[PDB]
Design an enzyme around this catalytic site. Structure first.
Site, PDB file in Angstrom:
ATOM      1  N   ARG A 217       0.826  -1.205   0.000  1.00 42.82           N
ATOM      2  CA  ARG A 217       0.000   0.000   0.000  1.00 42.82           C
ATOM      3  C   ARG A 217       0.858   1.253   0.000  1.00 42.82           C
ATOM      4  O   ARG A 217       0.560   2.214  -0.718  1.00 42.82           O
ATOM      5  CB  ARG A 217      -0.934   0.013   1.211  1.00 42.82           C
ATOM      6  CG  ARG A 217      -1.678   1.328   1.390  1.00 42.82           C
ATOM      7  CD  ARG A 217      -2.569   1.648   0.205  1.00 42.82           C
ATOM      8  NE  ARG A 217      -3.077   3.018   0.247  1.00 42.82           N
ATOM      9  CZ  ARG A 217      -3.635   3.630  -0.793  1.00 42.82           C
ATOM     10  NH1 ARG A 217      -3.751   2.982  -1.947  1.00 42.82           N
ATOM     11  NH2 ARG A 217      -4.074   4.884  -0.687  1.00 42.82           N
ATOM     12  N   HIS A 244     -12.262   0.796   9.405  1.00 44.78           N
ATOM     13  CA  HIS A 244     -12.499   0.118   8.142  1.00 44.78           C
ATOM     14  C   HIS A 244     -11.278   0.268   7.237  1.00 44.78           C
ATOM     15  O   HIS A 244     -10.541   1.255   7.320  1.00 44.78           O
ATOM     16  CB  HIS A 244     -13.751   0.695   7.471  1.00 44.78           C
ATOM     17  CG  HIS A 244     -14.162  -0.002   6.211  1.00 44.78           C
ATOM     18  ND1 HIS A 244     -13.693   0.367   4.968  1.00 44.78           N
ATOM     19  CD2 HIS A 244     -15.024  -1.022   5.998  1.00 44.78           C
ATOM     20  CE1 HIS A 244     -14.234  -0.408   4.046  1.00 44.78           C
ATOM     21  NE2 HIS A 244     -15.042  -1.262   4.646  1.00 44.78           N
ATOM     22  N   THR A 342     -12.027  -5.678   2.267  1.00 39.92           N
ATOM     23  CA  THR A 342     -11.230  -5.786   3.480  1.00 39.92           C
ATOM     24  C   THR A 342     -10.142  -6.834   3.300  1.00 39.92           C
ATOM     25  O   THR A 342      -9.026  -6.669   3.803  1.00 39.92           O
ATOM     26  CB  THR A 342     -12.108  -6.180   4.661  1.00 39.92           C
ATOM     27  OG1 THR A 342     -13.173  -5.242   4.787  1.00 39.92           O
ATOM     28  CG2 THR A 342     -11.284  -6.169   5.947  1.00 39.92           C
ATOM     29  N   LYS A 442     -33.547 -13.369 -10.197  1.00 39.78           N
ATOM     30  CA  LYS A 442     -33.836 -14.362 -11.234  1.00 39.78           C
ATOM     31  C   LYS A 442     -35.322 -14.250 -11.566  1.00 39.78           C
ATOM     32  O   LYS A 442     -36.182 -14.726 -10.818  1.00 39.78           O
ATOM     33  CB  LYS A 442     -33.464 -15.773 -10.783  1.00 39.78           C
ATOM     34  CG  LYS A 442     -33.670 -16.833 -11.865  1.00 39.78           C
ATOM     35  CD  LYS A 442     -33.531 -18.263 -11.333  1.00 39.78           C
ATOM     36  CE  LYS A 442     -32.072 -18.655 -11.112  1.00 39.78           C
ATOM     37  NZ  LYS A 442     -31.919 -20.101 -10.792  1.00 39.78           N
ATOM     38  N   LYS A 528     -23.011   0.761   1.418  1.00 39.03           N
ATOM     39  CA  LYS A 528     -23.536  -0.393   0.693  1.00 39.03           C
ATOM     40  C   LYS A 528     -24.971  -0.647   1.147  1.00 39.03           C
ATOM     41  O   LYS A 528     -25.285  -0.544   2.338  1.00 39.03           O
ATOM     42  CB  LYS A 528     -22.684  -1.644   0.941  1.00 39.03           C
ATOM     43  CG  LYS A 528     -21.179  -1.490   0.718  1.00 39.03           C
ATOM     44  CD  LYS A 528     -20.417  -2.643   1.390  1.00 39.03           C
ATOM     45  CE  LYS A 528     -18.895  -2.593   1.134  1.00 39.03           C
ATOM     46  NZ  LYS A 528     -18.176  -1.381   1.688  1.00 39.03           N
TER      47      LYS A 528
HETATM   48  N1  LIG Z   1     -15.129   1.666  -5.359  1.00 43.13           N
HETATM   49  C1  LIG Z   1     -16.221   0.826  -5.314  1.00 43.13           C
HETATM   50  N2  LIG Z   1     -17.116   0.904  -6.227  1.00 43.13           N
HETATM   51  C2  LIG Z   1     -18.171   0.099  -6.221  1.00 43.13           C
HETATM   52  N3  LIG Z   1     -18.310  -0.781  -5.264  1.00 43.13           N
HETATM   53  C3  LIG Z   1     -17.402  -0.874  -4.302  1.00 43.13           C
HETATM   54  C4  LIG Z   1     -16.360  -0.092  -4.310  1.00 43.13           C
HETATM   55  N4  LIG Z   1     -15.601  -0.391  -3.269  1.00 43.13           N
HETATM   56  C5  LIG Z   1     -16.177  -1.340  -2.622  1.00 43.13           C
HETATM   57  N5  LIG Z   1     -17.263  -1.620  -3.250  1.00 43.13           N
HETATM   58  C6  LIG Z   1     -17.953  -2.645  -2.577  1.00 43.13           C
HETATM   59  O1  LIG Z   1     -17.485  -2.889  -1.244  1.00 43.13           O
HETATM   60  C7  LIG Z   1     -17.304  -4.276  -1.135  1.00 43.13           C
HETATM   61  C8  LIG Z   1     -16.007  -4.574  -0.469  1.00 43.13           C
HETATM   62  O2  LIG Z   1     -16.404  -4.486   0.828  1.00 43.13           O
HETATM   63  S1  LIG Z   1     -15.466  -4.135   2.077  1.00 43.13           S
HETATM   64  O3  LIG Z   1     -15.565  -5.182   2.958  1.00 43.13           O
HETATM   65  O4  LIG Z   1     -16.154  -3.281   2.917  1.00 43.13           O
HETATM   66  N6  LIG Z   1     -13.929  -3.514   1.861  1.00 43.13           N
HETATM   67  C9  LIG Z   1     -13.910  -2.206   1.330  1.00 43.13           C
HETATM   68  O5  LIG Z   1     -14.859  -1.649   1.036  1.00 43.13           O
HETATM   69  C10 LIG Z   1     -12.558  -1.545   1.141  1.00 43.13           C
HETATM   70  C11 LIG Z   1     -11.301  -1.882   1.682  1.00 43.13           C
HETATM   71  S2  LIG Z   1     -10.410  -0.922   1.119  1.00 43.13           S
HETATM   72  C12 LIG Z   1     -11.172   0.015   0.242  1.00 43.13           C
HETATM   73  C13 LIG Z   1     -10.912   1.153  -0.505  1.00 43.13           C
HETATM   74  N7  LIG Z   1      -9.646   1.631  -0.311  1.00 43.13           N
HETATM   75  C14 LIG Z   1      -9.537   2.895  -1.155  1.00 43.13           C
HETATM   76  C15 LIG Z   1      -8.502   3.730  -1.349  1.00 43.13           C
HETATM   77  C16 LIG Z   1      -8.665   4.818  -2.160  1.00 43.13           C
HETATM   78  C17 LIG Z   1      -9.868   5.038  -2.743  1.00 43.13           C
HETATM   79  O6  LIG Z   1      -9.852   6.155  -3.516  1.00 43.13           O
HETATM   80  C18 LIG Z   1     -10.906   4.195  -2.548  1.00 43.13           C
HETATM   81  C19 LIG Z   1     -10.763   3.124  -1.749  1.00 43.13           C
HETATM   82  S3  LIG Z   1     -11.696   2.055  -1.379  1.00 43.13           S
HETATM   83  N8  LIG Z   1     -12.469  -0.353   0.268  1.00 43.13           N
HETATM   84  C20 LIG Z   1     -16.986  -4.591  -2.540  1.00 43.13           C
HETATM   85  O7  LIG Z   1     -17.112  -5.865  -2.851  1.00 43.13           O
HETATM   86  C21 LIG Z   1     -17.971  -3.835  -3.307  1.00 43.13           C
HETATM   87  O8  LIG Z   1     -19.280  -4.471  -3.289  1.00 43.13           O
END
Ligand SMILES: Nc1ncnc2c1ncn2[C@@H]1O[C@H](COS(=O)(=O)NC(=O)c2csc(-c3nc4ccc(O)cc4s3)n2)[C@@H](O)[C@H]1O
Ligand SMILES: C[C@H](O)CC[C@H](C)O
Ligand SMILES: C[C@H](O)CC[C@H](C)O
Length: 544
Positions: A217, A244, A342, A442, A528
């Site tokens: 990172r 988070h 995550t 569906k 979400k």
């Molecule tokens: N950017 C996105 N666009 C659309 N959907 C997104 C999404 N990010 C997560 N999602 C959703 O969150 C779910 C993942 O869930 S989670 O458990 O909570 N983990 C996260 O959401 C997670 C861990 S890290 C991280 C990010 N780090 C960043 C650093 C810079 C930046 O500009 C943006 C981000 S986002 N997001 C995904 O599967 C998806 O459904």
């Protein structure tokens, strides 16, 4: 054996630095603490600053205090707090000495908190005042916990040491923070953070992330294309939760860059614009649920935003139309996106600087690969074909804590993580996230994506917020339905809402399920939608 369908990340601008995540953090922050007037964190509400000097000195003191207390790589600490100026002091302290940090969501109920600390098994618990009681009610069931320390207190509080009195109990005489040397240890095997997983049914899981992942990172965040250029006197505005992964690893990278992290906890339109103006914010980091609070404001022109160059979003879908509108109102090339789980530590798809494409979430980051596979046979798909998104690289989690079975169900022997998301990549190798796989509907053996219907609903003016799911019917299995909060002063009816939906859809995509008007759509911290909760609400519309 077609590698033309595997999207690969470019080589990093800077080669990956050596050392633990704690060593890289310590190095960077010592350098910035030796530069006069550098501010690490600013609470924008109370207008209090903490310099990199104070933040470094207090993190070092916490590291040495925990070490003298007896904590080492065999131990874990919990950090349970709303965002604040003190959150990252015990986090950095633990990273410096190889103690694993488990952030526990401050708005967990006691059951979820018990789960989190049962997985992490902490020896010491850092908790804000607001969270103390819950910790106490849970602590009785976790004898591993030996010490509770209050984060947002200067004196002892209600019989518990604060971080300052704890440090004073354990620091040796004449301790000099600038002679402190962080511990060295295996960065692949020593866990840096234990984050709690989200979305999935059941109680959350413990996501173990080694120092290596934080190091990768720290490669990304200072990369000119996938990160932010390290320029002095840069202020970021963050409104993302620290427990988070999206708050954790962006904020850690911001410290690696010497940025000034400006914090808001209560988000209001005018306070947001004042903060952007008065602190000369160059980038605001947001979750999409906050956009409505300023997307249609009339105040934007009354403020000097000449320093603002970037609005970034993450953690959930951002509407293409809302994003384009907001980007055009602030004279921005777009809303920068990051996609991650995550379990992937941080964003593994980032919109690269200068390569915006509206509606996408970016391209594959350095060190990573991504593919899209068929939902029934797992075969790798080609350009512009939809399937499950798979990713692999050195920010994939080492595994779920004490749950090898869940780990193997998620990550295959080649290292591919199965995201659970439907996506595709286009000719230029930009990725688009379509929807969550377990939320497809569906109708008659045809897959309808609720996100598409939500975006269409959200177009409407009388419609403030929408959420779509399936209501069960013995014919068609499930019919698509909605939950709609209307704009203040609007009269819209279920008949004309399903008619507006029919206006821009095919046959199976028609919202034959009805509408349930609500005062708010059930969302999460990063925004979400709670599909189970939406189906739950879709019962009064099942009644007659
Ligand atoms: N950017 C996105 N666009 C659309 N959907 C997104 C999404 N990010 C997560 N999602 C959703 O969150 C779910 C993942 O869930 S989670 O458990 O909570 N983990 C996260 O959401 C997670 C861990 S890290 C991280 C990010 N780090 C960043 C650093 C810079 C930046 O500009 C943006 C981000 S986002 N997001 C995904 O599967 C998806 O459904
Ligand atoms: C290069 C790094 O700082 C050391 C990590 C190894 C695996 O011990
Ligand atoms: C840099 C300084 O701390 C900003 C003060 C104004 C009120 O925001």
């Amino acid at each position: 054996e077609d590698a033309k369908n595997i999207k690969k990340g470019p080589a990093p601008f800077y080669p990956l630095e050596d050392g633990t995540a704690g060593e890289q953090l310590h190095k960077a922050m010592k350098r910035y603490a030796l530069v006069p007037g550098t501010i690490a964190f600013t609470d924008a509400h109370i207008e209090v600053n903490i310099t990199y000097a104070e933040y470094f000195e207090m993190s070092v003191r916490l590291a040495e205090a925990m070490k003298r207390y007896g904590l080492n790589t065999n131990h874990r600490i919990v950090v349970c707090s709303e965002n604040s100026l003190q959150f990252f002091m015990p986090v950095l302290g633990a990273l410096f000495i190889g103690v694993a940090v488990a952030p526990a969501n401050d708005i967990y109920n006691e059951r979820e908190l018990l789960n989190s600390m049962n997985i992490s098994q902490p020896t010491v618990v850092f908790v804000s005042k607001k969270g103390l009681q819950k910790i106490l009610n849970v602590q009785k069931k976790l004898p591993i916990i030996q010490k509770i320390i209050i984060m947002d207190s200067k004196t002892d509080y209600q019989g518990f040491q604060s971080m300052y009195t704890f440090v004073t109990s354990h620091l040796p005489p004449g301790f000099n923070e600038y002679d402190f040397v962080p511990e060295s240890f295996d960065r692949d095997k020593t866990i840096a953070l234990i984050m709690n997983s989200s979305g999935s049914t059941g109680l959350p899981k413990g996501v173990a992330l080694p120092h290596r992942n934080a190091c990768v990172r720290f490669s990304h965040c200072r990369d000119p294309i996938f990160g932010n250029q390290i320029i002095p006197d840069t202020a970021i505005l963050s409104v993302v939760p620290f427990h988070h992964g999206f708050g954790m690893f962006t904020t850690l990278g911001f410290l690696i860059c010497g940025f000034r992290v400006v914090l808001m906890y209560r988000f209001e339109e005018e306070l947001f614009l004042r903060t952007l103006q008065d602190y000369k914010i160059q980038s605001a980091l947001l979750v999409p649920t906050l956009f409505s609070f300023f997307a249609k404001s009339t105040l934007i022109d009354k403020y000097d935003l000449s320093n603002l160059h970037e609005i970034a979003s993450g953690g959930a879908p951002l509407s293409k139309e809302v994003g384009e509108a907001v980007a055009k109102r602030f004279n921005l090339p777009g809303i920068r996106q990051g996609y991650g789980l995550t379990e992937t530590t941080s964003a593994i798809l980032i919109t690269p600087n200068g390569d915006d494409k509206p509606g996408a979430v970016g391209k594959v980051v350095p060190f990573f690969e991504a593919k899209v596979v068929d939902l029934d046979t797992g075969k790798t798909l080609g350009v512009n074909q939809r399937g499950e998104l798979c990713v692999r690289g050195p920010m994939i989690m080492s595994g779920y804590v004490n749950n090898p079975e869940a780990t193997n169900a998620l990550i295959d022997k080649d290292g591919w993580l199965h995201s659970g998301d439907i996506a595709y990549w286009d000719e230029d190798e930009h990725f688009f996230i379509v929807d969550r796989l377990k939320s497809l509907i569906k109708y008659k053996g045809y897959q309808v994506a609720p996100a598409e219907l939500e975006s269409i609903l959200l177009q409407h003016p009388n419609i403030f917020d929408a959420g779509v799911a399936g209501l069960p019917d013995d014919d068609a299995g499930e019919l698509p339905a909605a939950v709609v909060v209307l704009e203040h002063g609007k009269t819209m009816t279920e008949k004309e809402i399903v008619d507006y939906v029919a206006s821009q859809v095919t046959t199976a995509k028609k919202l034959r399920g009805g509408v349930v008007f609500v005062d708010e759509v059930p969302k999460g911290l990063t925004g979400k939608l709670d599909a189970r909760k939406i189906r739950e609400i879709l019962i009064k519309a099942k009644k007659g």
